[PDB]
Amino acid sequence: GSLPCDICKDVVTAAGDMLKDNATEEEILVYLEKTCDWLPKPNMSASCKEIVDSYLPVILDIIKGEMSRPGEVCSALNLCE
């Protein structure tokens, strides 16, 4: 899969699991930012940050809306084919 697709799957899964543990949205952002910062290449970190900043908000809304399948959520947002 494309890099945006691969990152999206991570983000949606992470956000979903953390919400199911009643994590706060702020904490979720902090967690995902860490992931972005740990990625081994600058282009990966950059793509991760852009995806988190652009899509995490609506992803949280979608999961709260009872839709948490990573592949499906990401395909809908056109991050996956």
PDB file of C-alpha atoms in Angstrom:
ATOM      1  CA  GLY A   1       0.000   0.000   0.000  1.00  0.00           C
ATOM      2  CA  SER A   2       0.922   3.656  -0.433  1.00  0.00           C
ATOM      3  CA  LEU A   3       2.596   5.447   2.475  1.00  0.00           C
ATOM      4  CA  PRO A   4      -0.516   7.537   3.228  1.00  0.00           C
ATOM      5  CA  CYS A   5      -2.589   4.340   3.272  1.00  0.00           C
ATOM      6  CA  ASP A   6      -0.169   2.590   5.616  1.00  0.00           C
ATOM      7  CA  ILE A   7      -0.075   5.583   7.961  1.00  0.00           C
ATOM      8  CA  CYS A   8      -3.865   5.993   7.905  1.00  0.00           C
ATOM      9  CA  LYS A   9      -4.377   2.384   9.001  1.00  0.00           C
ATOM     10  CA  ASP A  10      -2.069   2.985  11.966  1.00  0.00           C
ATOM     11  CA  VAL A  11      -3.810   6.227  12.926  1.00  0.00           C
ATOM     12  CA  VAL A  12      -7.362   4.875  12.744  1.00  0.00           C
ATOM     13  CA  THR A  13      -6.477   1.724  14.696  1.00  0.00           C
ATOM     14  CA  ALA A  14      -4.545   3.647  17.345  1.00  0.00           C
ATOM     15  CA  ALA A  15      -7.265   6.281  17.722  1.00  0.00           C
ATOM     16  CA  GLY A  16      -9.996   3.653  17.894  1.00  0.00           C
ATOM     17  CA  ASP A  17      -8.247   1.498  20.478  1.00  0.00           C
ATOM     18  CA  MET A  18      -7.383   4.508  22.632  1.00  0.00           C
ATOM     19  CA  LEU A  19     -10.962   5.816  22.511  1.00  0.00           C
ATOM     20  CA  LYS A  20     -12.220   2.377  23.543  1.00  0.00           C
ATOM     21  CA  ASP A  21      -9.956   2.815  26.583  1.00  0.00           C
ATOM     22  CA  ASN A  22     -11.586   6.217  27.210  1.00  0.00           C
ATOM     23  CA  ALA A  23      -8.396   8.098  26.345  1.00  0.00           C
ATOM     24  CA  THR A  24      -8.857  11.820  25.754  1.00  0.00           C
ATOM     25  CA  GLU A  25      -8.541  13.229  22.249  1.00  0.00           C
ATOM     26  CA  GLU A  26      -5.561  15.294  23.400  1.00  0.00           C
ATOM     27  CA  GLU A  27      -3.765  12.175  24.631  1.00  0.00           C
ATOM     28  CA  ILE A  28      -4.538  10.479  21.323  1.00  0.00           C
ATOM     29  CA  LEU A  29      -2.917  13.378  19.465  1.00  0.00           C
ATOM     30  CA  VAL A  30       0.156  13.147  21.734  1.00  0.00           C
ATOM     31  CA  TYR A  31       0.494   9.402  21.095  1.00  0.00           C
ATOM     32  CA  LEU A  32       0.206   9.746  17.313  1.00  0.00           C
ATOM     33  CA  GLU A  33       2.616  12.674  17.240  1.00  0.00           C
ATOM     34  CA  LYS A  34       5.180  10.497  18.997  1.00  0.00           C
ATOM     35  CA  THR A  35       4.765   7.858  16.286  1.00  0.00           C
ATOM     36  CA  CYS A  36       5.285  10.499  13.608  1.00  0.00           C
ATOM     37  CA  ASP A  37       8.422  11.736  15.375  1.00  0.00           C
ATOM     38  CA  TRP A  38       9.879   8.220  15.654  1.00  0.00           C
ATOM     39  CA  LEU A  39       9.545   7.322  11.960  1.00  0.00           C
ATOM     40  CA  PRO A  40      13.082   6.791  10.613  1.00  0.00           C
ATOM     41  CA  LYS A  41      12.994   9.106   7.558  1.00  0.00           C
ATOM     42  CA  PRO A  42      12.066  12.820   7.344  1.00  0.00           C
ATOM     43  CA  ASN A  43       9.547  12.250   4.534  1.00  0.00           C
ATOM     44  CA  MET A  44       7.746   9.608   6.607  1.00  0.00           C
ATOM     45  CA  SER A  45       7.602  11.873   9.663  1.00  0.00           C
ATOM     46  CA  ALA A  46       6.358  14.757   7.511  1.00  0.00           C
ATOM     47  CA  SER A  47       3.666  12.676   5.798  1.00  0.00           C
ATOM     48  CA  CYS A  48       2.584  11.307   9.169  1.00  0.00           C
ATOM     49  CA  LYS A  49       2.284  14.789  10.698  1.00  0.00           C
ATOM     50  CA  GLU A  50       0.315  16.114   7.722  1.00  0.00           C
ATOM     51  CA  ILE A  51      -2.066  13.158   7.894  1.00  0.00           C
ATOM     52  CA  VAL A  52      -2.547  13.491  11.652  1.00  0.00           C
ATOM     53  CA  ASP A  53      -3.118  17.246  11.486  1.00  0.00           C
ATOM     54  CA  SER A  54      -5.454  16.990   8.464  1.00  0.00           C
ATOM     55  CA  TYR A  55      -7.477  13.866   9.193  1.00  0.00           C
ATOM     56  CA  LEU A  56      -7.307  12.936  12.884  1.00  0.00           C
ATOM     57  CA  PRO A  57     -10.179  15.304  13.735  1.00  0.00           C
ATOM     58  CA  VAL A  58     -12.690  13.739  11.336  1.00  0.00           C
ATOM     59  CA  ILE A  59     -11.296  10.265  12.070  1.00  0.00           C
ATOM     60  CA  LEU A  60     -12.187  10.794  15.733  1.00  0.00           C
ATOM     61  CA  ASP A  61     -15.687  11.904  14.697  1.00  0.00           C
ATOM     62  CA  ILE A  62     -16.080   8.838  12.493  1.00  0.00           C
ATOM     63  CA  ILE A  63     -14.978   6.450  15.257  1.00  0.00           C
ATOM     64  CA  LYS A  64     -17.292   8.167  17.745  1.00  0.00           C
ATOM     65  CA  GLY A  65     -19.932   7.639  15.060  1.00  0.00           C
ATOM     66  CA  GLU A  66     -19.400   3.870  15.560  1.00  0.00           C
ATOM     67  CA  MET A  67     -17.257   3.217  12.467  1.00  0.00           C
ATOM     68  CA  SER A  68     -13.724   2.052  13.344  1.00  0.00           C
ATOM     69  CA  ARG A  69     -12.585  -0.396  10.635  1.00  0.00           C
ATOM     70  CA  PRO A  70      -9.153   0.952   9.583  1.00  0.00           C
ATOM     71  CA  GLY A  71      -9.233  -0.171   5.951  1.00  0.00           C
ATOM     72  CA  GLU A  72     -12.749   1.127   5.431  1.00  0.00           C
ATOM     73  CA  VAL A  73     -12.252   4.491   7.140  1.00  0.00           C
ATOM     74  CA  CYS A  74      -9.029   5.070   5.215  1.00  0.00           C
ATOM     75  CA  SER A  75     -10.493   4.060   1.838  1.00  0.00           C
ATOM     76  CA  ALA A  76     -13.380   6.459   2.395  1.00  0.00           C
ATOM     77  CA  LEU A  77     -11.002   9.347   3.069  1.00  0.00           C
ATOM     78  CA  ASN A  78      -9.132   8.345  -0.124  1.00  0.00           C
ATOM     79  CA  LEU A  79      -5.931   7.599   1.773  1.00  0.00           C
ATOM     80  CA  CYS A  80      -6.287   3.976   0.665  1.00  0.00           C
ATOM     81  CA  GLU A  81      -7.383   2.645  -2.731  1.00  0.00           C
TER      82      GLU A  81
END
